[PDB]
């Protein structure tokens, strides 16, 4: 495994190298300190922004994905065990470029739909959105090597700082932003396309009725589709197996229960 | 107070004992540090999921028990007086054991409740509406014993991990589960029945337009009351000293300001 | 800077001596460990709640006032110069008399508009409204000295803590109260009067449907401008550059996109 660390970080510090300069700086921001896989992926995904200038080499980066590396599968081998956690983590380790490719237009999308953004580095320091989507690919990755445990304890961890609360189930493309945030709620089946802007209080979800009888079935696809260019106004509730199209308005406190077709606004 | 907390510690050992294999676990789980209140009951309630296996023995329990009520008598004292806090601790200490099979329901009402959940064990180790509802338990035997600060710092912590507002005055009975949580606000005054399923942006509360005039009433019955098996979908608002009926289902996004009546539907 | 902090560290010493007692206490309340902006202004603004009466003297608030100017002025370099971080906390130093004096309306309006509080020192202690006003009152200046970073880092502090969104932008008058605050969005351009008092889930801001196109106009008044004695209900939405007038009641999830007149009521 730290062979094939070597040349994922090798990987990503091109790929740094290559970043226009919007996603670097030459300032030494504050030091924060966050739950672990936040703080290890912000220092790997965007290393201007959280560590001292004079210690980002390559070496450094490898050396903080070696501690991620470390703890993730640690941590999935108390849930699960120990040869599936090392899947699981070649996985992530496997896909850490393409992540880091669609974080670059997440934030794009952030700076683009949000006019109190001075900046690509105040949305990478500090927007929750951003935090949690960072957390959220990579807890994805989990998800779809079947891992069903520490996925959720890490979107959780993301849950308590920003109120956001996406389940690592959910499939969601890039461009995408979160504005504001809390509330929140994306389910484990939930699909998302290209372009979606999502603001406070937004549910893309499901709700269960009791029906006792008493123990409901296990998953199944029972959370919305949403297409691509589709924004979803404050305190709006979408529910259900149900498909929204692309390029759709919703309004806020919208109660959304069927399908919306492609180009329109709702209200 | 010490032969009290054998006495507890010892009874809760034996639960834990004669629990059903769902509620136990030879794993040995990530080690998390969460506020005193929680990290304390997570130990004293569900040992094998927050504990080193080689360590559960009674005398563990018995040990955390102690730290626990150490801090709350401390706690307690610092907003009242030495011999209130006493008081108020002996009760919490004598309500422990039913609080316990109380939590088994509501366990059992989560997975129930909840198509994402694969076992107990994720529920317990980092459901936020389970959290909540561990503390929020202890945190209301405070309150009947007629304590109303240190209980609400207790449950601001909960408030400030979890987006869960619960009032520790809130009467709650068992099987009960929050799904997701954030944005929930259950007042002071509220009563809340068996098997209630409450969904995010949900309150069970009140408000008060401005009178001024300029201070308002001191408590009273003023937040509503809820029966039996009530699920409340997403960002219902239910206001006020009124009634609500067993097997009721409110919609998303509903306003509800008169009585509900029993089984029935509102959207 | 020291001795303009030495000046100021006195007059809010001589503003403690001569509160009224409601805003004083001789408990010693249980230490607490918040983000350093609060865990500093809390220990200046109420030093009975937050320090060991046996410690309280005017050097002591210097000294805590010397290590929150500090702070603030290492953050605000790293952002942007030496310069003009010095400028904008002389700003900061220069208005604390006057917030600790709106604070204290704050705290009025906070236990006025709530049945549940027992007195000022649980506000002052826990309740998250108010610790977001804290940190905000102080944020805002360094918003008003053109400063456009680290005032926003200071408020996501803020929002992670007690779930509520408060852009340093807004314009917001005394006796403020948030009471529950989860979910609460108030927007860079908003202006809010005396007498504000805002629930759970309640948007003071916008929504921007995707023009693709691409990228949206930077800044520009786009919040709601609201009048003095307005209670805003529960998951209001209030979108857009509209006006709310004096004495309006906002009802529950209402979704509000135009200007509002004085004395209404609206549902």
Known sequence: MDNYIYSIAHQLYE????????????????????????QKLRKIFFPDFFMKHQKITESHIASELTKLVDYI???????????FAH?????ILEKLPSIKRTLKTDLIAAYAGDPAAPGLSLIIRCYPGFQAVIVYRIAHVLYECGERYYCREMMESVHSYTSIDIHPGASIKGHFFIDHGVGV?????????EWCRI??????????????????????????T?????????????????IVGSHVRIGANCWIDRDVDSNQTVY
């Open 185 to 193: 709620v994306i389910g484990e089946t939930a699909i998302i396309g």
């Open 15 to 38: 790929m740094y190298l290559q970043d226009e300069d919007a996603f670097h700086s030459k300032r030494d921001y504050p030091h924060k300190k966050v739950f672990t896989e936040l």
């Open 226 to 242: 949403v297409g691509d260019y589709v924004t979803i106004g404050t305190g709006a509730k979408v529910l259900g197996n149900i």
């Open 199 to 224: 603001y406070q209080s937004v549910t893309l979800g499901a709700m269960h009725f009791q029906e006792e009888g008493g123990v409901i079935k296990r998953g199944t696809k029972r959370h919305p």
């Open 73 to 83: 599968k640690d941590s999935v081998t108390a849930y699960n065990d120990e040869l």
């Open 87 to 91: 899947q699981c983590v070649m996985a």
